[PDB]
XYZ file of C-alpha atoms in Angstrom:
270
model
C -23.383 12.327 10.245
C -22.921 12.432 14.274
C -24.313 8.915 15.221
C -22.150 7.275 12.776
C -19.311 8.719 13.507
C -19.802 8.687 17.599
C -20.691 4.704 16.540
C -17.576 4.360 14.694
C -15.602 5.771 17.635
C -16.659 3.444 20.267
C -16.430 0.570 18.311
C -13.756 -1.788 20.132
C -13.054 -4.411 17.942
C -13.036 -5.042 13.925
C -16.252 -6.961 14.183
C -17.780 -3.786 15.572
C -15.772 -1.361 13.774
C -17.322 -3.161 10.466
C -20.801 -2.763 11.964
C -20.922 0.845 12.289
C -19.847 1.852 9.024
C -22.041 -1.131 7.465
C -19.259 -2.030 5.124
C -16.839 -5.104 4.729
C -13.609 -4.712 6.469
C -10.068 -6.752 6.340
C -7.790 -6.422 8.652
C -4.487 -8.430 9.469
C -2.100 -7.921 12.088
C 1.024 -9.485 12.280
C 4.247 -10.296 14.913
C 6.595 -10.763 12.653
C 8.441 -12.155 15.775
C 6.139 -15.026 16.255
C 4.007 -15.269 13.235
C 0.912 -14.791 15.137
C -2.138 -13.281 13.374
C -5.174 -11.267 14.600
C -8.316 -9.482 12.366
C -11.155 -9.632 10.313
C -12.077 -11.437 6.659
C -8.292 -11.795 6.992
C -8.600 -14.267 3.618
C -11.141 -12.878 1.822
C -10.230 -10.475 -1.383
C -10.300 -6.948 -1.839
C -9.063 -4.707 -4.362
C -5.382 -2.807 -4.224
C -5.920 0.045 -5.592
C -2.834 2.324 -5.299
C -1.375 -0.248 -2.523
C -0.029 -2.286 -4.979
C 2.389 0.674 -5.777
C 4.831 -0.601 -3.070
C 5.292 -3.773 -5.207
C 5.619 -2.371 -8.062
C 8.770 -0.227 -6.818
C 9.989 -3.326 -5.284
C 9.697 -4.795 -8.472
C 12.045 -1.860 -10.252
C 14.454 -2.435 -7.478
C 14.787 -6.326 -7.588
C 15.780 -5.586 -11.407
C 18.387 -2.930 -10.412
C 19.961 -5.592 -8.719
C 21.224 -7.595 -12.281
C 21.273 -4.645 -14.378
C 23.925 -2.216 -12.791
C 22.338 1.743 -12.884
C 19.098 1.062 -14.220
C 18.027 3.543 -10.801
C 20.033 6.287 -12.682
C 17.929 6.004 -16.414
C 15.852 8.663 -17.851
C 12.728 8.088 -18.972
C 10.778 10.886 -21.222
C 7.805 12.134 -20.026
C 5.142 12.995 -22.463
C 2.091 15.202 -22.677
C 0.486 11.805 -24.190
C 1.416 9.487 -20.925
C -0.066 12.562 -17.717
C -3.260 11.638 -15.953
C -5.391 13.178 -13.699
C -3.731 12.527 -10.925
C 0.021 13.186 -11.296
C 1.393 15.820 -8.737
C 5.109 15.480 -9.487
C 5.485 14.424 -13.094
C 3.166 17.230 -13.776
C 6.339 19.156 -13.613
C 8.476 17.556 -16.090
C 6.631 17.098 -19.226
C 8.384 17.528 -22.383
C 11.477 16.580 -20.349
C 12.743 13.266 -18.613
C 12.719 12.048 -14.641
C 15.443 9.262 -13.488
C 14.192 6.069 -12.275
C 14.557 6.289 -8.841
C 12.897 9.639 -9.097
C 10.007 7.960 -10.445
C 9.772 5.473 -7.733
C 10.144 7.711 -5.007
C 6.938 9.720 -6.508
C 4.743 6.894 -6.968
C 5.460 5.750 -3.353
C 4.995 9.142 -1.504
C 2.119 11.107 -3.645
C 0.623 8.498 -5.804
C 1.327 9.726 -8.821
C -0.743 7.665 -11.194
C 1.711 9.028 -14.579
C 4.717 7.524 -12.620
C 3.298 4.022 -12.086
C 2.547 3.398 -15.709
C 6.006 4.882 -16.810
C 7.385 2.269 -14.603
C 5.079 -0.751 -15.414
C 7.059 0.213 -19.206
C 10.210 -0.111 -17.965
C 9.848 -3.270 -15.917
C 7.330 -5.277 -18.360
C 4.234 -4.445 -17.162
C 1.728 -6.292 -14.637
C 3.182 -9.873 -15.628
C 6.694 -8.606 -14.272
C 5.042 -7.689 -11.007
C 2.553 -10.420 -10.216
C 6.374 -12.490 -11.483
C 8.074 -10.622 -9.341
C 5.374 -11.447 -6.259
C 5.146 -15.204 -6.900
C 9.154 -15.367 -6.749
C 8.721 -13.856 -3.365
C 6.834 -16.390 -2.091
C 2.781 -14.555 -2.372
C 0.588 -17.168 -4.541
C -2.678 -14.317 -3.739
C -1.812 -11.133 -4.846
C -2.186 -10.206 -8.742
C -1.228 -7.130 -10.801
C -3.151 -7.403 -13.906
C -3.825 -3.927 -15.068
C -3.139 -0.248 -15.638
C -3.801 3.054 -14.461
C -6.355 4.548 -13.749
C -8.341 1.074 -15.043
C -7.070 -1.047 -12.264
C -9.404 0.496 -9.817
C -12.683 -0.620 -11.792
C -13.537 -3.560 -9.604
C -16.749 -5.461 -9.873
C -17.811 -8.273 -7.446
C -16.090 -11.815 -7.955
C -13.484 -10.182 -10.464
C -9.945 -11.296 -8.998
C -8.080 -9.031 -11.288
C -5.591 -6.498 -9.194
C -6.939 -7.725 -5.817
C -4.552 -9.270 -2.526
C -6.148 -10.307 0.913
C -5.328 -8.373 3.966
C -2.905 -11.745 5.124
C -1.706 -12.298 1.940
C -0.432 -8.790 1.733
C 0.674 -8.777 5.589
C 3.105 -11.353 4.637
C 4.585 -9.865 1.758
C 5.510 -6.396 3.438
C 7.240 -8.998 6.154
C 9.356 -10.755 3.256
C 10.195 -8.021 1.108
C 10.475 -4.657 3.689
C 11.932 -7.096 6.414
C 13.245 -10.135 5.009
C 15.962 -10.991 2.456
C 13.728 -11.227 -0.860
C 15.661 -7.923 -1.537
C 19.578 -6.985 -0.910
C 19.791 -4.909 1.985
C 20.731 -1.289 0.500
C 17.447 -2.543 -1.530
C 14.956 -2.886 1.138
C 16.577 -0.038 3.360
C 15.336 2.194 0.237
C 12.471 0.774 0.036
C 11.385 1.097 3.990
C 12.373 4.841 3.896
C 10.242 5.995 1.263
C 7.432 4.179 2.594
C 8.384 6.089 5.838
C 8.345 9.104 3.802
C 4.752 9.293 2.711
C 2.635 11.805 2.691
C -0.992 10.765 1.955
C -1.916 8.611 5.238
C -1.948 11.394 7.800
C -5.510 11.054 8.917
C -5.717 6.772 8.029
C -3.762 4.443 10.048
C -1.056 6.762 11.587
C -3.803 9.062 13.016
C -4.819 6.319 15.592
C -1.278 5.621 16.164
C 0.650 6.046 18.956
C 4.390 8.017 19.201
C 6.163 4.902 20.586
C 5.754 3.449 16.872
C 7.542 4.853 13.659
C 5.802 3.969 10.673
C 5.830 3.240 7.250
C 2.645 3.144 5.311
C 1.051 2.868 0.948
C -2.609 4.579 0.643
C -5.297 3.051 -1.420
C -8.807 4.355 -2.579
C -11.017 4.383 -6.054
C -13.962 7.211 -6.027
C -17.484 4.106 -5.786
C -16.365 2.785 -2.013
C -12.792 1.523 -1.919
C -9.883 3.180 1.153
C -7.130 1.156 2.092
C -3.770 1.496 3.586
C -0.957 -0.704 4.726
C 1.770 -0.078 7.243
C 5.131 -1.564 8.837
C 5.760 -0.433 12.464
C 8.901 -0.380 13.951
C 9.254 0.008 17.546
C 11.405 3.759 18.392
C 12.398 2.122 21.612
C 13.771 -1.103 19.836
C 12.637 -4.839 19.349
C 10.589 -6.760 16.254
C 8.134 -4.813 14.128
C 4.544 -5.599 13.578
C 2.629 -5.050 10.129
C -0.768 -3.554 9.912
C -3.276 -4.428 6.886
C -5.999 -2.425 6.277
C -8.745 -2.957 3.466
C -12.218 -1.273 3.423
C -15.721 -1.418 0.919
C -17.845 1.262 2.216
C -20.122 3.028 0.155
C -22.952 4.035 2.730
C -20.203 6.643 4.202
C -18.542 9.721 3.075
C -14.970 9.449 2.016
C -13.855 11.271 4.877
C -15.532 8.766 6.929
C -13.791 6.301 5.513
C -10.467 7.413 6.729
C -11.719 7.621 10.107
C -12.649 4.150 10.414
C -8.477 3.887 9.173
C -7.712 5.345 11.910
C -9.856 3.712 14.248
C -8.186 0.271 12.715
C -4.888 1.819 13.919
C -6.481 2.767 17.981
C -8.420 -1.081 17.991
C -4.272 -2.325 17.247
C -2.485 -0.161 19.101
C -4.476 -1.569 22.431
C -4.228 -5.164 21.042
C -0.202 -5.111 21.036
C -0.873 -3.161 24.490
């Protein structure tokens, strides 16, 4: 495993980066000062996976806004609805979570048992890809289920964004005025609060940025993860995009060319 990793470290651009891993990598970095764009296959689809998650709360919230303490409902949560994956709801079977409880887990851990208890109370993946259009994204589509949604094949469109399709939609929705403002500051903080992207995009980051991030992955060749960065000593924030295919590496590897994503970007905003 040593050359490709010592080729994955020297790589100095995307182009590169996507070389040494011999994958397909999408990458979109945005000023959300200027507009201005840099990266890689920055229009070309890949599949969500768990990114989509973000949405999906932002979806929840944008209803909370015309239906006054829908965040404080209980929703049961049955032996029938727990997954594989479900590190928090785990806990409360036979009993109920509130809605913003539920949101807060499928942000920071994942939990896969929390995002389809939510898709139920919102109205499913035609509420969300609703809720995206109305936000101005005419890319991104929510389509299906867990754990089903991360069964992508080639050409299949279903549950997929681009990396500047995506890049936009953090700026509109965790920046911009899609939401009400005690909406989006909840939003940004649990993003800011997760805790599965230690060694992706915020291990190639550096202190003078505090950042928000969603993880993605499915177990053939699929990693992502997506980030806001705000600047600690003050000014506009950039957003980072990160999408990766790469089956002829380990999953470990995977995150490493994350964070190499994160170095490459870091010395581009310089």
């Amino acid at each position: 495993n040593a050359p490709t990793d010592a080729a994955i470290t020297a790589a100095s651009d995307f182009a590169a980066l996507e070389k040494a891993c011999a994958g397909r990598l999408g990458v979109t970095l945005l000023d959300t000062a200027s507009g201005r764009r840099i990266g890689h296959r920055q229009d070309e689809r890949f599949p969500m996976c768990s990114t989509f998650k973000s949405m999906l709360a932002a979806t929840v919230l944008s209803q909370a806004e015309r239906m006054p303490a829908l965040l404080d409902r209980r929703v049961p949560v049955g032996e029938a609805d727990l997954l594989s994956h479900a590190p928090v709801t785990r806990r409360h079977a036979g009993k109920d979570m509130t809605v913003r409880d539920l949101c807060r887990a499928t942000i920071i851990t994942s939990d896969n048992t929390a995002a389809n208890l939510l898709f139920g109370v919102v109205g499913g993946p035609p509420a969300v890809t609703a809720f995206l259009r109305a936000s101005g994204d005419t890319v991104s589509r929510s389509d299906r289920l867990e754990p089903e949604l991360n069964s992508f094949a080639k050409g299949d469109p279903r549950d997929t964004t681009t990396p500047a399709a995506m890049a936009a939609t953090l700026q509109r929705v965790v920046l911009g005025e899609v939401l009400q403002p005690a909406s989006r500051q909840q939003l940004a903080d649990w993003l800011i609060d997760n805790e599965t992207g230690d060694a992706c995009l915020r291990a190639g980051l550096g202190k003078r940025w505090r950042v928000g991030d969603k993880t993605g992955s499915n177990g053939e060749d699929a990693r992502n993860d997506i980030a806001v960065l705000w600047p600690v000593a003050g000014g506009a924030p950039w957003v980072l995009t990160a999408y990766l295919q790469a089956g002829a590496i380990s999953y470990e590897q995977r995150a490493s060319v994350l964070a190499q994503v994160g170095r490459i970007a870091d010395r581009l905003i310089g």
